[PDB]
Design a protein around this ligand. Structure first.
Ligand SMILES: [Cd+2]
Ligand SMILES: [Cd+2]
Ligand SMILES: [Cd+2]
Ligand SMILES: [Cd+2]
Length: 31
């Protein structure tokens, strides 16, 4: 885990702020 369970790796969109709050197995706001 880095930021979320869908972007557990300081994802870009999740650079410095888990701005991804939607993905119960997959997201479409980032990757
Ligand atoms: Cd995520
Ligand atoms: Cd993200
Ligand atoms: Cd996140
Ligand atoms: Cd996302």
């Amino acid at each position: 885990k880095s930021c979320c369970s869908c972007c557990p790796v300081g994802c870009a969109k999740c650079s410095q702020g888990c701005i991804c709050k939607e993905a119960s197995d997959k997201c479409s706001c980032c990757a």
